[PDB]
DNA sequence: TGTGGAT
DNA sequence: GGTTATCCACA
DNA sequence: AACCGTATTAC
DNA sequence: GTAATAC
């Protein structure tokens, strides 16, 4: 069932037949249609393939995707491998040219390297190179078949026999249809491969183990050492026909691309605005579509589709799940999406599909985006270069800490817990006035996490270590109480539980203790949570030792868990483990660039308007003259020229004058224009003051953060205790 | 697997317990969250329940959702059924306030009448009753939430001292949060129910057997008699807590409600433009989003999502499948959507999902929308009154016959085959000139269908009967030829096959014949189809009987099939069986409304412009006064007045004068404006003539159809034959 | 059997 | 990203 | 519309 | 034996 299905070739012929291993069933469709059916076979691969150098060995044979791969090859596996039993001469890996494409290239080549080495050794394993670009100056002129793999090959296609043409930028084999696929990547004549070889069994064995085995730090190190986080990778210039390449440099090249991408652009939040790229995109798109808190809800599907076609070239479920998460107030301390309908529960029951639900940005999420229009924040091109997207949001509140971030990259993970908005702002304000402020002091203002699930946080000294180093283990325990019953009889009653825990799975594990009678005294386990409150009720027998039970539960269930801080985020393009200080200063530095840029923006604006008001005031005093002059001019350009020569209007002033609608001659109040002149001069002064004086700027940073606090502050939810 | 999964209630109190039956798992969850877990259980339904008449038993008693329905209630199957054993004292059917809500209500009430009567007579089966509207908005501490079931209760809530606060118009249970759901339709206190009774076994064995039994024609008849297509049905006002209705007026209203909707607004094409509503909404949406043939492709999920949030409240796969079909050139004779990627194949291998594919309208699809921006067509309010959509498209070509339509409805279906564009035009064009033209005459121009898949149509008479009455059975036969082989051998070479036949499945069924040796002579079946060409070779044994084989294949496989014209369409809102004539006159009448409407639009434009230009030419001669006048005036609107009163300009002319930019005063060339008068006056003449002179109009209708023909004509694909 | 818009 | 059900009318 | 797999870090 | 963005 769980394997991808095989489409054979028509002819049994080991000497020239090909098995295409294709990324995903959709692309298997296109491959199955563009193929030559007599010597080309197809096995679709169902997303990410197992790791045969992490996962076990019973696992590796239960893996259906593997078993069907071994089957179809018809050679045997590892210690039973015969090369002349094999049904194909070429095993051809063919993936999207996305970076997960690279990840799959990686994952296969290990399996094969490890369990089919003579097949790798005899150079039977290849890789298909799909194109990146397509060029057409036709469609009823004729067409102009033209493709490109390198930005260099593309720049060559500014020639060909036509211009003003199109350039389709491919994002998968999904977007290619049979004819496109045959020519470009499947037809022996035209297609372009690479053969995978073994140059050095030492240097190539080594490369795999580090990259693909479960030692995380040699991997982190390989990434530290090899990956350029701050640089591009001016790629190879695509040799014709086939091209030999070491397993070594491939597992290298490919895993470097995958590692880098998921570190920078997937699983790790940016240190300033606290968003993963997918989440930033949700916010930006839903903002641009005016899907804000003040206006109407909006079908989730519409939202998700726009996000996927404009910014985020990934699956719809990835986006809907991300959007939905931002809407749940047991995951986010401050929700960035409001959403009508079923957005799940704490029992983790599935949210309603995006066809049902509807949604819009939360009020506070407007503040992450505040002043994005005012050139505060560096924009870059979307995946196809139709449209720009922000690399980071203004962030008028310190989201990273408030809402935290839990993610898993390559060579790195991250747990940052949520915090109280007020508390986080208090620290930051202090640090604005005290650059060198140290933990002990900051912790007067930010004592610890504030989970939206509430609960009891235990381990003040481990908080400190996490706030210093970025790592530390703290304890979270459910809010419990006792209640009496008839028959005397007590019952334990749970109202808050640990963050990231599934209520139904917890109730079940508890009840499994009762059933297994691991600790004497439990009668019934009842979930009594209605829509308004959480309320698990553990009912004990007649004279049960209330507190001995409670203890086994904490110990041996998830009624108590340890939260583990591992605070990683992206500083200056790079993954970084970080405590409260770099986080808070990073933010402050960010708000500084924003307030400064917003001020320059607003100021250049105000000056233009001033220069015009200046001109319009003068015009009124010579209005007859100005009109007679426009009447005596030949055209628009002439008039402007006359106005400058005869009256010294600037270009800007003349253009504005020349384009006043006639009805504007009704409003000629010079007193009212003067009032406006005053207001502009003052605005410019205030804005020049900010730009001119760090402290004038910092005091505004603080003024704003205080307003945000006042507008959005809510009580702590999790109580802090010291002993553990 | 398969069946909606049960969520038990906490204590077994069959005195007061309630099994809620909820349309879908997404709403199932919402109900779960919103319930009182003590005495309310939740069985969700996975959409359409089996019909308990139609579906004959054994299939019924393995139907997973049915098993898990009887299991739950813990009573039995009418005969063994025992009210006293039952786990619930109310079975409450809860469905979307939608029209499939109605169909599902309908489907269940058969199962209860027909295998569980005692529950229904006793009054233990109830109904749902979600609200249709929610009103108001007034901060946080709110002062402004009330709901609404009827149109009548809307006037009620519009009345609130404050201002006009915001209105939600619910589209199902998947847009309702669990508080909203408990409070409005699940709390016994506040909820409102319909108790289902049996008020005469007689009038609810006739009513339940007509509506849901095998005989189409009584149901067709019932609808024909009872259902008012051209008329609304807003009636029943909302009463006190519980209300009574009989199993008659429930069945009646609900299946009537349903059948109306899916006859009109789903499964049957409109006779003018040949479109089902989803297809028209696809076109109109994509078109309005500038997603046209001339601009570049665009992610499918973006198009689909905008269709669903704007026009079509239904499933994304229902929408995407329709879109994919319109792109498939073996289902449509003139594709309306161009889709890049895996858009299926003839073997019916699944198309890539909407995240992979991208798409835009074909060029000819633009001709269905031609002149839509010129008030050429009635528009309605969309499903939530945020936007407007066309009830019918301009249809600059006769799409209904050209692409045909295959649909299934209630007490009605529709098979219309596709025709060749050029031939359909030729017949319409003749019939413009000869309204009383007979079939034999039209059939000179339009002899029979033209399938995209081609093949051989045999049966001139039944073609003629279909073209007369709307019904008729024709033979579609695959195109074949015989090819010699090595050493006294033959093979059959299939090169075209019948419309709607999956090639893979056919090749399968032919191979199965060989395997079982139903007829003798078959060596091998080889699908030799590739990207460029269709080619099935059936390779015969030495001295087999090519004829006996072939004719056995035509007979017992789908290498030849029967096509049954069942030409049904919507004419004046009612379903109607039609032949060529009422089809072609429907179109000609439409193009008439369109050409006229359009011409009035373009003429209103040109008069406005002309009048303005008159006013401008005048203005020159009083320029100094107009200027003096406009400076004097207190404001814009004031200065317009003074222009009218003082100088005798229309509103139109004054508004244009008053919004001239100052630089227009440089232009005193009346001559260019006079050439423009001239050209405008001529244009208005051409236009007004079309409006005044029926023939002038028709000659245009003809000119234009001829242009379409010439631009889009393609050779016939199916050959015709007359008898065998 | 299977068509094609729906749950 | 495959997979699994139902309804509806008509061979 | 639920249900199934994988990579990735890290308890 | 789970978290959360990806195939
Ligand atoms: N056939 C293919 N499927 C997937 N894929 C995508 C999912 C998504 O878009 O969210 C998903 O949720 C998903 C779940 C699965 F359980 C799953 N598998 C069960 C096994 O059969 C594999 C797979 Cl594979 C899944 C893919 F990304 C690519 C595919 F080709
Ligand atoms: N859970 C529910 N699912 C459906 N539903 C919707 C589908 C769609 O919108 O494209 C679909 O393709 C689909 C396929 C199925 F095979 C299927 N079933 C197999 C059985 O488990 C039912 C169901 Cl049910 C299906 C529904 F319309 C409503 C639902 F609640
Ligand atoms: Cl101005
Ligand atoms: Cl003008
Ligand atoms: Mg991809
Ligand atoms: Mg998924
Ligand atoms: Mg524990
Ligand atoms: Mg609905
Ligand atoms: Mg479906
Ligand atoms: Mg037949």
Residue numbers in the entry:
A (entry chain B), B (entry chain A): 411 to 648, 1001 to 1486
Quote the authors verbatim:
Co-crystallisation trials were set up to include the ParE30-ParC55 fusion protein, the strongly cleaved 18-mer E-site DNA duplex (present on the pneumococcal chromosome) or the 18-mer V-site DNA sequence (present in ColE1 plasmids) plus 2 mM delafloxacin to saturate drug binding. Crystals of the cleavage complex were obtained with both DNA duplexes and the structures were solved at 2.4 Å resolution by molecular replacement. The delafloxacin complex presents as a dimer with the two ParC55 breakage-reunion domains in a ‘closed’ conformation flanked by the two ParE30 metal binding TOPRIM domains, with a single DNA helix bound across the dimer interface. The ParE domains- formed of four parallel β-sheets and surrounding α-helices- plus the ParC winged helix domain (WHD) and ‘tower’ domains together form the protein groove that accommodates a single V-site (or E site DNA) duplex as the G-gate DNA. Protein binding induces a U-shaped bend in the DNA involving the symmetric minor groove intercalation of the two ParC I170 sidechains. A magnesium-chelated delafloxacin molecule is intercalated into the wedge-shaped space between the -1 and +1 nucleotides at each end of the 4-bp staggered DNA break site introduced into the 18-mer V-site duplex by nucleophilic attack of the two ParC Y118 residues. The 5′-phosphates at the ends of the DNA break are covalently linked to ParC Y118 residues confirming capture of the cleavage complex. Analysis of DNA conformation using the w3DNA programme revealed that all regions of the drug-captured G-gate DNA adopt a B-form helix.
Delafloxacin is a potent anionic fluoroquinolone approved for the treatment of respiratory infections that acts by trapping the DNA cleavage complexes of bacterial topoisomerase IV and gyrase. Topo IV is a tetrameric complex made up of two ParE and two ParC subunits that mediates unlinking of interlocked daughter chromosomes. Fluoroquinolones stabilise this complex which cellular processes convert into a lethal lesion, likely a frank double-stranded DNA break.
